[PDB]
Design a protein around this ligand. Structure first.
Ligand code: HEM
Ligand code: HEM
Ligand code: 8PD
Ligand code: 8PD
Lengths: 452, 452
């Protein structure tokens, strides 16, 4: 009854993941097979969902809970029972959720604004200081900005990424760890000795990330300054339910979790948004007119960023086409029938293929490939479970407002301060590291010569 | 130091309550004066609190206990030492609390469900049987439903409100008693002979309510049916702490208390929720889609009502904007400093202005007047003591789960069975009877023709 892509004998569908672009491969399979398909590997099965019709059922928290995909099981080798890679039923999930949600309160967000501006001004100064006909490496600079922003706002720690021509060592190790997790998805026999070098390199990259976590904890312990940031809540906050704080082992996992989850996908978002703006110059002009009208002061105020409505619509439309954490996994809490057609047993898994949900013509209309921010004129018009770049329910993204405030601030400043040229007529090439990001995307930025 | 609204010479602030909308007047004063203001009358003072930062301190049960506001001292003339109008230190408060808490257990709620459906089906049948272009009197029908539900579930007594074109006589007397309590708030000389007719009518209304209580007790005493409801617990239950049952005098006060507290505010909630739904059609679409997807049987089950997450979020957002028991009062157990700024002496009174707490932009963001159920999509994101429609601590609403189960069931069935039209473009007009409810709110309901 359920469609299934092509098989490879006893390897079933597993060789379909032998690609550097597995999510894009699964999107093409969804276009061929429709709203649901079965995906089998030796010893495993999951079902990929692409329609709002089925995903609205998958998002019913009475029926389905967050599952760890194979990807997240591999990421858990370094992120442990941090928020992203914990099961809902592990005591540390609800404890850390309750302890860290206050770090994303409206008061906390206003508190982060000045440090977001510190890093955004470093980006604008970098681009102001370029010589004639020099270009910008877009995803590279967006990763400099977003890593520095979570480091400073979250941990009062300066990665100083704009002082480096090479990616930050933490980034080199994170990307190689994410790429190893993604490459491991196709491995039939991961304990074959052919993967011993992969395992060694993975452990080395995990140690690089943990050495930096050690430095952040040591810097806070040695600090004479009074901080009130995400790390303050990790070290001091008590869960109202249990009355307990986090232990040291869980805090280390939360720091690695927030450094990764708290920047990589925001770098992707900013990169895709600038891509779509240079490919749609009338949209760029509309966004630049709003930035010039609203951002009347040398640096943006908190309230001014909240008033960048069209910049927000541009970011939402970029998340519609290329949600940068492009899937999430669920399991059936109990036996249930999906869509009146597909009986599931307790424990059966689903994968939500977010880029395909976001191309559901029954929700968005036939023009789903067009970049049209005006779809989000009134975001309330979008049905439940139709636009899900931040996941679902109590396991939804804790950082959504942080990410959108940062991205809106930075894109607003970029559009205020520069005109942009797609000088190479760049062909979109989406690199996969579990997360999605344009690769090789370069532009030229001509200063409007507006002082900071 | 403390702000204070305008004065009337020796009457101080008392004539500010000479209005049929005193809570709405106090909300406007809070908007003008901010998080705290003094309110003086001849011989008394209280302080109105509107900010989460001060209300979280007021909600510290080590520092403050429930006070009887002037409103509750007047209601105590008929509700005595029932749960709502008892002091925490009166023996009958903890005794009745321990005897009746089990009547609001999950097991009790599953037991009430069928009788809630009996009344909900009567509402749906009434609206199905209307002719073309007839309309619904919303608060009137919600009062028919909620009074009948507490009567049947609580006391196995049928008010038969859907058999009446006029309000039930118990409602006429209750509303006139609550209106008298509210009107008495402004009286500098309550024993002036000008109020002799007010006093006579108040006593008549109290007698109507007590005659109905007599009938309920007599009907149970004469019954050949074995009930296990709220009245069973009042008449037979022993407090585990003292080992004592309630005496006859306290039982009479509890029955009056539960008939009033157990329906009026739920009628308000349902009326405000339907108001917000017809004013926010995208929210109505989301709630109606959930009702259709979840309520797959002609008779909703207990489990299906628990599954209506979005309907629950609608109800919580209605309670955010218009909490239908809109204030509660506290006194200082000992000398203490509120908010590091306002010294209080033992016995000093506070009023918590719940609608203003719920508009605290430091908690909710600047868009506080917008109806957005999605504020409640991630429950732990609501800060401690930011959302208090059911009061605080051991003196919180005993009936919260009953009210929300009833309202979720009924609103779910309404949205399953009908489309709604705001055919008059109704202008919100909030009637005050201590409690709040829309007045004159009418809609048209077009049947979806789904059988019961
Ligand atoms: C545009 C940027 C972002 C996107 C697209 C994004 C996307 C997501 C998605 C889809 C999930 C759900 C994962 C699943 O169910 O497996 C998630 C969870 C999470 N995200 Fe984000 N995220 C972004 C930014 C952020 C930021 C900036 C932070 C931190 C400051 C953050 C922290 C987290 C955490 C901790 C979780 C786990 C929450 C839980 O289950 O308790 N994310 N994110
Ligand atoms: C949406 C509906 C309701 C709202 C907004 C509401 C609100 C409240 C509030 C604010 C208080 C505390 C007042 C104070 O501190 O002076 C309270 C107390 C109380 N409520 Fe409710 N109520 C609702 C429904 C119900 C129902 C359905 C019942 C009974 C079935 C009920 C029974 C009581 C009782 C008995 C108390 C006194 C509790 C005691 O202090 O021990 N309420 N309610
Ligand atoms: C520590 C913080 C974590 C940040 C990592 C975020 C990663 C977000 C994206 C995860 C989804 C990527 C899915 C990859 C494609 C896929 O469909 N995988 C399935 C393959 C079926 O086995 C799986 O992992 O079973
Ligand atoms: C028996 C069951 C009880 C039903 C009663 C529910 C009523 C709940 C709402 C009570 C709050 C009404 C506040 C009225 C406005 C106000 O602020 N009153 C102050 C005025 C200052 O004296 C007061 O009563 O001092």
């Amino acid at each position: 009854e359920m469609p299934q892509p092509k098989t490879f004998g006893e390897l079933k569908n597993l060789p379909l993941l032998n690609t550097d672009k597995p999510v894009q491969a699964l999107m093409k399979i969804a276009d061929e097979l429709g709203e649901i398909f079965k995906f089998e590997a030796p010893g495993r099965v999951t079902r990929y969902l692409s329609s709002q019709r089925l995903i609205k059922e998958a998002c019913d928290e009475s029926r389905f809970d967050k599952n760890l995909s194979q990807a997240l099981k591999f990421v858990r080798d370094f992120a442990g029972d941090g928020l992203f890679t914990s099961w809902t039923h592990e005591k540390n999930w609800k404890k850390a959720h309750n302890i860290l949600l206050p770090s994303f309160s409206q008061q906390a967000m206003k508190g982060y604004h000045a440090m977001m501006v510190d890093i955004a001004v470093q980006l604008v100064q970098k681009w102001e200081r370029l010589n004639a006909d020099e270009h910008i490496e877009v995803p590279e600079d967006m990763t400099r900005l977003t890593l520095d922003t979570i480091g400073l706002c979250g941990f009062n720690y300066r990665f100083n990424s704009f002082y480096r021509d090479q990616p930050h060592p933490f980034i080199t190790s994170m990307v190689r760890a994410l790429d190893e997790a993604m490459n491991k998805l196709q491995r039939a026999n991961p304990d074959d000795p052919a993967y011993d070098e992969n395992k060694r390199q993975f452990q080395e990259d995990i140690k690089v990330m943990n050495d930096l976590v050690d430095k952040i904890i040591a810097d806070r312990k040695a600090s004479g300054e009074q901080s009130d940031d995400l790390l303050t809540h990790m070290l001091n906050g008590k869960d109202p339910e249990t009355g307990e704080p986090l232990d040291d082992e869980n805090i280390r996992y939360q720091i690695i979790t927030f450094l990764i989850a708290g920047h990589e996908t925001t770098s992707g978002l900013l990169s895709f948004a600038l891509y779509f703006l240079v490919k749609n110059p009338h949209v760029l002009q509309k966004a630049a007119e709003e930035a010039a009208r609203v951002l009347v002061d040398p640096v943006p105020s908190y309230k001014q960023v909240k008033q960048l409505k069209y910049v927000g619509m541009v970011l939402n439309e970029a998340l519609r086409l290329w949600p940068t954490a492009p899937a999430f996994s669920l399991y059936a809490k109990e036996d249930t029938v999906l869509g009146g057609e597909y009986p599931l047993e307790k424990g059966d898994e689903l994968m939500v293929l977010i880029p395909q949900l976001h191309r559901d013509k029954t929700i968005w209309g036939d023009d789903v490939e067009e970049f049209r921010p005006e779809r989000f004129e009134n975001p309330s018009a979008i049905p439940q479970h139709a636009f899900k770049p931040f996941g679902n329910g109590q396991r939804a993204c804790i950082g959504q407002q942080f990410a959108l405030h940062e991205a809106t601030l930075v894109l607003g400043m970029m559009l205020k301060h520069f005109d942009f040229e797609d000088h190479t007529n760049y062909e979109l090439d989406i690199k996969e590291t579990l997360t999605l990001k344009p690769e090789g995307f370069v532009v030229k930025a001509k200063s409007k010569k507006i002082p900071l």
